[PDB]
Amino acid sequence: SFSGYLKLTDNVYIKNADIVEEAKKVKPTVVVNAANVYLKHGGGVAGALNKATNNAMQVESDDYIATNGPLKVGGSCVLSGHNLAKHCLHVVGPNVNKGEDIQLLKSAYENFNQHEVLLAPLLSAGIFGADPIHSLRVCVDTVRTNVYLAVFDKNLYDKLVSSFL
Numbered sequence: 001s002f003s004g005y006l007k008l009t010d011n012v013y014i015k016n017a018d019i020v021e022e023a024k025k026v027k028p029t030v031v032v033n034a035a036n037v038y039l040k041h042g043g044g045v046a047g048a049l050n051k052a053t054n055n056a057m058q059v060e061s062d063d064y065i066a067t068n069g070p071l072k073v074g075g076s077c078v079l080s081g082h083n084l085a086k087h088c089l090h091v092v093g094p095n096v097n098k099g100e101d102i103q104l105l106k107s108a109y110e111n112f113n114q115h116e117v118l119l120a121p122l123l124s125a126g127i128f129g130a131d132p133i134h135s136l137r138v139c140v141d142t143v144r145t146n147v148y149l150a151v152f153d154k155n156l157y158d159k160l161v162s163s164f165l
């Protein structure tokens with residue numbers, strides 16, 4: 001099970017960790033990917049998860065897109081978790097660097113409520129351009145299921161914990 005997490009609320013937990021290493025250790029039922037609408041896993045969390053699957057996540061994702069078309073910003077899809085988890089919940093947060101509306105971040109976190117427990121990154125943070133402090137606030141105010149947040153960057157983790165409330 002999940003270990004070394006700081007408890008933020010009744011249902012939200014956080015740890016300074018690489019979500020790939022966390023997924024490989026815990027083998028959670030669900031790992032969340034910080035996806036884009038095309039499921040093109042090039043960088044950030046998506047590029048790291050995909051590389052850990054030896055590109056099997058991208059091969060599966062290209063078949064999904066060929067059949068279904070792109071996701072909506074704020075939407076999600078459930079695909080295989082490969083060697084990392086039972087399932088991967090690909091969630092698209094708004095990318096502020098591409099000009100998407102930050103109000104879609106709450107819709108993105110609502111996808112987590114369809115799963116009892118999840119290992120996840122902060123949505124729209126990193127290369128997506130949003131303020132991670134805002135992202136954690138939206139996560140805590142939107143997700144009601146048990147979410148274990150892995151924050152890769154130690155300096156950001158400390159800033160998030162010391163400013164939480």
Ligand SMILES: c1nc(N2CC[C@@H](n3cncn3)C2)c2cc[nH]c2n1
Pocket residue numbers: 017018019020044045048121122125126127150151152153
């Ligand atoms: C958790 N979060 C991650 N990320 C969050 C936004 C993004 N980033 C940008 N600066 C700091 N981190 C990537 C990653 C990347 C690999 N493994 C991870 N585990």
